[PDB]
Amino acid sequence: VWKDADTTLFCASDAKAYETEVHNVWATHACVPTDPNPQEIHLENVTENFNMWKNNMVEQMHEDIISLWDQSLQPCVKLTGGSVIKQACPKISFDPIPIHYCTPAGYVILKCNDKNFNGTGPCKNVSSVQCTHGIKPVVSTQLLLNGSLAEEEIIIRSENLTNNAKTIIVHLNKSVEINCTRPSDIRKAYCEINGTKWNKVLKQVTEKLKEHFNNKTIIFQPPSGGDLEITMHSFNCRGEFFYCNTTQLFNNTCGCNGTITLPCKIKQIINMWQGTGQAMYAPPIDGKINCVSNITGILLTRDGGANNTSNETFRPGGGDMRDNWRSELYKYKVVQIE
Numbered sequence: 067v068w069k070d071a072d073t074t075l076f077c078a079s080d081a082k083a084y085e086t087e088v089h090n091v092w093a094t095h096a097c098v099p100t101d102p103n104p105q106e107i108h109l110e111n112v113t114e115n116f117n118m119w120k121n122n123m124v125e126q127m128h129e130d131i132i133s134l135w136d137q138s139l140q141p142c143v144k145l146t147g148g149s150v151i152k153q154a155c156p157k158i159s160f161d162p163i164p165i166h167y168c169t170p171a172g173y174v175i176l177k178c179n180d181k182n183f184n185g186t187g188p189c190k191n192v193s194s195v196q197c198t199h200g201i202k203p204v205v206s207t208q209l210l211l212n213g214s215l216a217e218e219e220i221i222i223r224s225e226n227l228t229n230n231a232k233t234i235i236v237h238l239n240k241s242v243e244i245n246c247t248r249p250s251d252i253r254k255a256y257c258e259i260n261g262t263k264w265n266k267v268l269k270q271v272t273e274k275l276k277e278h279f280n281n282k283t284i285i286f287q288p289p290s291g292g293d294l295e296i297t298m299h300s301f302n303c304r305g306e307f308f309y310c311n312t313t314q315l316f317n318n319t320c321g322c323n324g325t326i327t328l329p330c331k332i333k334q335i336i337n338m339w340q341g342t343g344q345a346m347y348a349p350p351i352d353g354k355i356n357c358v359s360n361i362t363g364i365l366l367t368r369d370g371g372a373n374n375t376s377n378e379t380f381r382p383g384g385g386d387m388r389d390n391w392r393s394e395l396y397k398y399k400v401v402q403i404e
């Protein structure tokens with residue numbers, strides 16, 4: 067017997083005590099070691115309601131990662147609310163590691179094992195766990211990186227598809243590598259994507275979106291304004307902030323199918339995701355800066371006043387990292403053992 071409840075979670079990780087990498091350092095002192103003997107109990111004949119869009123676990127992970135960045139990635143200058151802090155900004159070791167979220171005594175985590183689960187509504191195949199799986203806290207916009215994959219079909223996730231203001235999370239079932247490099251202009255970078263791989267996945271995505279939108283025509287367009295962090299695909303590679311133009315990723319025409327090369331820039335002046343504010347970092351480290359990531363999801367925003375047209379147009383979105391955490395926490399919820 068249990069009931070829906072919120073409580074303060076703790077974290078577990080395989081952090082290395084000797085590592086200078088900042089995620090390891092934070093997990094070493096803020097988490098416990100991962101459960102060496104994790105147990106999963108299947109709940110016979112249990113149906114349970116989930117709502118990934120109203121899930122306190124997401125808020126708690128958000129608070130953790132903000133703390134992680136605040137103790138690890140300090141900018142030369144932080145500009146918040148009129149205040150201006152000038153603190154040490156050395157170059158660091160940066161590579162996210164999986165973090166597990168675990169319940170204290172008197173609580174368990176319920177896990178939805180329905181392979182088609184979209185994040186809201188009833189789940190027929192429910193198990194209970196002490197900890198989630200290991201989630202890498204990858205900060206990014208537009209593209210979800212290094213996550214998990216949907217097990218069966220591509221999944222569309224949204225708090226309310228009919229409401230165009232609600233962010234759409236696309237959960238891929240086959241990852242697509244994105245290989246970004248600043249070769250050894252020191253801020254000029256690029257990302258390489260297999261155009262055959264990507265265009266095929268994207269076609270499947272549009273077909274999935276057809277199913278939710280009455281077989282309408284699915285059109286992609288570049289973001290319609292905003293800050294560079296959201297009009298570009300933003301992410302952190304080895305501590306450097308990359309900003310990549312994704313126009314060639316979301317062009318509906320696909321003489322295509324070669325390597326897709328996105329132009330990128332490393333920016334020193336950042337619009338922080340942790341909260342409204344601007345931060346400045348030192349110029350990039352020397353030599354080849356490279357990151358090979360898996361695209362496992364897409365963040366989309368649908369265009370509004372098309373209620374009576376023939377087209378549904380989608381633009382890459384992001385900005386609220388809670389959606390990133392939500393994309394992995396969607397199948398979990400905390401309950402109190404009554």
Ligand SMILES: N=C(N)N1CCC[C@H]1C(=O)N1CCN(C(=O)N2CCC[C@H](C(=O)Nc3ccc(Cl)c(F)c3)C2)CC1
Nearest residue numbers: 205206207293295300301302337338339340341342385
């Ligand atoms: N957290 C809470 N409680 N919130 C309540 C609703 C909005 C949200 C919120 O209050 N906020 C304020 C701060 N935010 C912001 O100002 N944004 C505008 C500028 C860009 C932002 C970006 O995505 N930055 C970024 C930086 C580096 C990387 Cl690598 C990256 F992938 C992304 C979006 C986040 C949402």
Ligand SMILES: *[C@@H]1O[C@H](CO)[C@@H](O)[C@H](O)[C@H]1NC(C)=O
Nearest residue numbers: 106108179180190191192193
């Ligand atoms: C339910 O999910 C479990 C994972 O715990 C997996 O073995 C299988 O996909 C499902 N099994 C049943 C009996 O539904």
Ligand SMILES: *[C@@H]1O[C@H](CO)[C@@H](O)[C@H](O)[C@H]1NC(C)=O
Nearest residue numbers: 184186187188222223224227
């Ligand atoms: C998710 O599944 C539930 C089934 O109960 C349904 O009500 C809802 O419309 C679905 N949402 C999406 C985006 O598929």
Ligand SMILES: *[C@@H]1O[C@H](CO)[C@@H](O)[C@H](O)[C@H]1NC(C)=O
Nearest residue numbers: 212213215240241358359360
């Ligand atoms: C990328 O995807 C492949 C296959 O989908 C997987 O084996 C590999 O572990 C993934 N890499 C990362 C860093 O997630």
Ligand SMILES: *[C@@H]1O[C@H](CO)[C@@H](O)[C@H](O)[C@H]1NC(C)=O
Nearest residue numbers: 217218219220239240270274
């Ligand atoms: C991914 O899902 C789509 C349906 O959305 C399906 O057609 C495709 O075969 C799936 N691919 C894999 C590798 O499971």
Ligand SMILES: *[C@@H]1O[C@H](CO)[C@@H](O)[C@H](O)[C@H]1NC(C)=O
Nearest residue numbers: 225226227228229230231232
């Ligand atoms: C979803 O959004 C539409 C359009 O904004 C609105 O009419 C509808 O009431 C919403 N549905 C729910 C369940 O909130």
Ligand SMILES: *[C@@H]1O[C@H](CO)[C@@H](O)[C@H](O)[C@H]1NC(C)=O
Nearest residue numbers: 243245246247258356357358
């Ligand atoms: C990534 O791209 C760089 C530069 O083009 C190349 O040297 C490297 O081999 C690529 N890595 C992979 C895994 O494709």
Ligand SMILES: *[C@@H]1O[C@H](CO)[C@@H](O)[C@H](O)[C@H]1NC(C)=O
Nearest residue numbers: 259260261262263264266325
């Ligand atoms: C690009 O992806 C396709 C489909 O997965 C694959 O067959 C092809 O070998 C890839 N190209 C390269 C150069 O690896």
Ligand SMILES: *[C@@H]1O[C@H](CO)[C@@H](O)[C@H](O)[C@H]1NC(C)=O
Nearest residue numbers: 288294297298311312313314
């Ligand atoms: C991305 O590239 C396209 C074409 O190269 C360009 O028209 C567009 O302005 C670029 N986007 C941004 C945000 O600079």
Ligand SMILES: *[C@@H]1O[C@H](CO)[C@@H](O)[C@H](O)[C@H]1NC(C)=O
Nearest residue numbers: 162211212301302357358359
């Ligand atoms: C994704 O994971 C790979 C493998 O650990 C790593 O090399 C890469 O830098 C990661 N990408 C990001 C954006 O953290």
